[PDB]
């Protein structure tokens, strides 16, 4: 809020925090959005089967890999923006409390961990690589819809918990029912109850497991009941989430 | 809210009925939830072939089966809780009227029936085994969302009946239509009308039968009509159920 | 109120039209519902491949076919009920205006046409046979939910028309798009635009065509757009239909 | 609403713009709707493989192709109507501002471009042929529901943008999750992240990819989360679109 009053720190903060403050602020916001989108495209295209061996980018002095070059450019821009915001913040105590800044730090972390490891062990490497996808959330800084979605999810945590709990109850119940209904066959597509968990989830969400359906009569009755109960139970805590989203979406206007 | 008044039955009743009454009450509630979850996990993992022919656990003096040990421990805890609640209840006349106590009683019955059978014949044994899954509802004592769902279902029995009746009407109508539309084929995937019941249910719920679709033109028109009518008819009595759920869910605050 | 004044026609009319009038009226209503359900079960079970070739029942003096016996008994009961109601109606002018009597008449018509054909070419016979399924609507006389659904459909004719028209627009648009996107393939699952009509209907209703999906990139973009647009367009006129149903359903009590 | 006032231009404009003006206006409206439907049927049936090959019509002096004859008749009627409305318009300044006239012009363009090409080279041919499908929107002139849908879409552009943006976020996130969950397999159905985009779209819309499902446990957890999140995120900005549609639909009466 309050400018630093240095006549230069306040100007930089207002340029890098309020896109509507001036023309260069809008240009910088557009550039940041373009860089984020380019980083997303590079992250998606690194996994393409046509193109290191387990990290997606090979570090070299000459920077032979084009994907490494693009990732390095994006990380350099992100680090510049984050450092400049950190230096130009009026109150640096509350800088680390904002989620929109933790998203920014967590999007730069995987690059430096990989570089440090390579300069100086496979499951953790892939875990770090998966954290790279969390930089798509940096669009929340420039998208008000994404911020509204974040507020809705924060305000509807109990509702999400109830939805997951109800789905868990239904999944276990109908998995047990469909296992015990189709247990007396030699070609049972549900060998056990855990094997029927995903079928229960898919039937309840009405995604549909394709042609893999129960073969018995009791199995088909259980499948029909599962299809009904999924619609009946998912749609109970969803309307309150939609109401919260509408409240947070029309509050901006 | 009536205390036992014995100065000793009251202490046990308040500990085992009001988790918020003290610290040990909450510890006991957490322990009970953990035991219920462990029993659920054991029930699900008994059917896994990787880790006694129709029940999933062999009762023996040596207790060789770990699953038998886990089930016995869970049943002992459930029986302890139920017996202590039954003894410490202020009014024992209304104890058996509460659904939350019938759920607790019906979750201990399958273990003792199996024990009596083993101490002293196949389909009924599997039926009793299927009843074991009803102990997942013992979480309703510790989950307010589950109690709210129970109240919603109690208050919306007419609406569930209408939903099932409408689904039955649509299923029979569209099964007849799709059987008679594709009757003049040698490779008809719908040999009869009962064979087309599950396809009708799956199309109406928009679960989707995968690649199995009518091959004729009239069959495809009937399938399109079924897909439309399922959405059109399932979504009529569901909003009132959602309204009942919202009423029972916001009535707490 | 104004009684029929016959002193005998009124007694029969009140018995066969007002189930709440007395105990025998309730017994007759229960018997009629049971007979309707038995007729429905017989109609569904005639088509089973285990159990003449174009009518489902072979007419004989001895009545060898059990299905013919059941159909004859149900038709005799329906004709008795219809004739007694027609004779005992206070105003016979408005008897044929009620839809609940046209349903009753049209459920007896297929039986006598078949009897006349047997006693005294093929497509019309199967058309008449398909008309037999309309006797499931005779439950509307004894079910208030079915009458409420009928009133809702009468009051939402424009809304159903708009839903069908919007689906037609979307189906043609997306069928053209997915044919033109996947035209340049030798293994194209969409040889023409009419062949892509049902895929468009199924994608729009989110039923899902299984594993048959466009193989190109533009085809997959068109499929994603179809999946979005179906949800977005079916859900526009459905809420007004739901509102009409709620109005006709809460007005009952 | 002001007539041309020429006593002949006004008469033509009122005949060709207000169907309720007289009987001939209604006859002309019915004829125009029939011609539009005939053109749509011809466009759909041109692609049928039973019947040059990359343009949809072969030009000859004798007009051998029946489809060319039908398309030429439809285009002649459309051009006559458009020219007569352009000549009979009261104010030609606002003629090009109405969307219902731009739709009319674009639906006639592909025929004249193609004719000029043949009388006096592959991808843009597909583009032009795809543009032919826009003549289905000429029904908006005669259908009030289509105009209401157009108003709803114009008034809900931000909501559509949010829906597409949320879809893109979810698709990228869940495609990355399901690629990295099923990366350590030799039979991985998701070779890369772009190859898993359409699976994510189909799962989120609950269309269902048939029997193609993740084989790992983490893959199935990601699939279940995708199925939940699709329902949870598509249904947030859709209710506001439905509200806009209801506002534009009940405003007539
Ligand atoms: K589906
Ligand atoms: K679905």
Author numbering:
A (entry chain B), B (entry chain C), C (entry chain D), D (entry chain A): 138 to 188, 207 to 275, 289 to 421
Sentences from the paper on this structure:
We report here the structure of the corresponding W366F mutant in the Kv1.2 channel background, which shows a nearly identical dilation. While the corresponding mutation W434F in Shaker essentially abolishes ion current through the channel the Kv1.2s mutant allows currents to flow transiently on depolarization, but decay to less than 3% of the peak within 80 ms. Here we shall call the cryo-EM structure of Kv1.2s-W366F the “inactivated channel” structure, keeping in mind that other distinct inactivated channel conformations are likely to exist. When W17’ is mutated to phenylalanine, it is no longer an H-bond donor to D30’. The resulting destabilization of D30’ allows it to reorient toward the external water-filled vestibule. Y28’ normally participates in H-bonds with the pore-helix residues W18’ and S22’ (right-hand panels), but with the release of D30’, and presumably the entry of water molecules into the space surrounding the P-loop, the side chain of Y28’ also reorients toward the external solution, filling some of the original volume occupied by the side chain of D30’. The result is an enlargement of the ion-binding site IS2 to a width of 5.1Å between opposing carbonyl oxygens and an even wider (11 Å) cavity is formed at the level of IS1. As in the inactivated Shaker structure strong ion densities are seen in IS3 and IS4. We were able to build the atomic model unambiguously into the 2.5 Å map that was obtained with C4 symmetry imposed.
Among the most-studied ion channel proteins is the Kv1 family of tetrameric, six-transmembrane-segment, voltage-gated potassium (Kv) channels. We present near-atomic-resolution cryo-EM structures of the mammalian voltage-gated potassium channel Kv1.2 in open, C-type inactivated, toxin-blocked and sodium-bound states at 3.2 Å, 2.5 Å, 3.2 Å, and 2.9Å. As observed in other Kv1 and Kv2 structures, the voltage-sensing domains (VSDs) contain the membrane-spanning S1–S4 helixes while the S5, S6, pore helix and selectivity filter P-loop form the ion-conduction pore in a domain-swapped configuration. The selectivity filter of potassium channels consists of an array of four copies of the extended loop (the P-loop) formed by a highly conserved sequence, in this case TTVGYGD.
